[PDB]
Amino acid sequence: VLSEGEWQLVLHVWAKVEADVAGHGQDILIRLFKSHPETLEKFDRFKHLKTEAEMKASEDLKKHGVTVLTALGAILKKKGHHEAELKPLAQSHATKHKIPIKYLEFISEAIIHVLHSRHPGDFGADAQGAMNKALELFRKDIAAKYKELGYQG
Numbered sequence: 001v002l003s004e005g006e007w008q009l010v011l012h013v014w015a016k017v018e019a020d021v022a023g024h025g026q027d028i029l030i031r032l033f034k035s036h037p038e039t040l041e042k043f044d045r046f047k048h049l050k051t052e053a054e055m056k057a058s059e060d061l062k063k064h065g066v067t068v069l070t071a072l073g074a075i076l077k078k079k080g081h082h083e084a085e086l087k088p089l090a091q092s093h094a095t096k097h098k099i100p101i102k103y104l105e106f107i108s109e110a111i112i113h114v115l116h117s118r119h120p121g122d123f124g125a126d127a128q129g130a131m132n133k134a135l136e137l138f139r140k141d142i143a144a145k146y147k148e149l150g151y152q153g
């Protein structure tokens with residue numbers, strides 16, 4: 001469980017992300033695809049993109065980034081009380097997109113990395129820690145669902 005103090009650290013930096021959601025989302029997905037190119041194979045929509053330049057130039061990829069961070073922000077603001085928002089996400093990701101839990105770990109790291117790059121002042125080690133805990137909580141709850149449906153592994 002995160003403390004109120006840990007949640008305030010998470011939401012404080014998240015408020016800055018919202019000042020440029022598209023930029024953050026585009027950096028996050030690109031970091032993911034480069035660092036773990038198997039994740040890009042899961043997107044029919046983006047697998048024709050080969051270079052970083054190409055990825056940066058894609059408006060559609062930018063759009064999807066926004067969809068991703070908008071959905072995550074709605075979850076984080078619930079400070080753990082996210083059942084209604086996390087359940088349909090788990091379902092689509094398990095049964096339709098077929099995204100293994102390991103990939104959620106990879107994107108979580110991409111998120112931390114980018115937040116470190118863009119907000120060094122408001123993202124010190126305590127904030128980093130807090131954010132890692134919130135993302136673990138997200139995964140843990142997604143995994144429980146996957147298991148119910150028979151997709152944990």
Ligand code: HEM
Nearest residue numbers: 039040042043045067068071072089092097099103104107
């Ligand atoms: C931060 C974690 C993630 C969030 C919050 C998130 C959110 C979303 C949202 C809201 C959608 C559209 C609605 C839906 O189908 O549920 C979407 C679709 C999708 N997601 Fe996730 N996602 C996450 C992680 C991932 C990861 C790691 C991958 C794996 C490569 C992935 C692959 C997909 C795919 C393939 C679609 C459909 C894309 C399309 O063709 O339009 N997602 N995601």
